[PDB]
């Protein structure tokens, strides 16, 4: 979990 997120984070 939080894979696409830490990504989705800079990704927004």
Place of tokens 């984070």: 9
Rounded Cα distance between 11 and 2, Å, is: 13
For residue 11, give both structure tokens. Answer: 């990704």
Spatial distance between the Cα atoms of 6 and 12, rounded to a whole number of angstroms: 10
Beta-carbon-side half-sphere exposure of residue 3 (alpha carbons within 13 Å): 1
Dist CA 12 CA 2 (whole Å): 13
Name the token pair of 7: 């990504």
Instruction: Find the angle CA(8)-CA(10)-CA(7) to the nearest 5 degrees.
Output: 40
Residue 8 CB burial class (10 angstroms; 0-12, 13-18, ≥19): exposed
Q: Report DSSP letters for the chain, one per residue.
A: --TTHHHHHHH-
């Amino acid at each position: 979990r939080r894979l696409i997120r830490l990504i989705l984070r800079l990704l927004r």
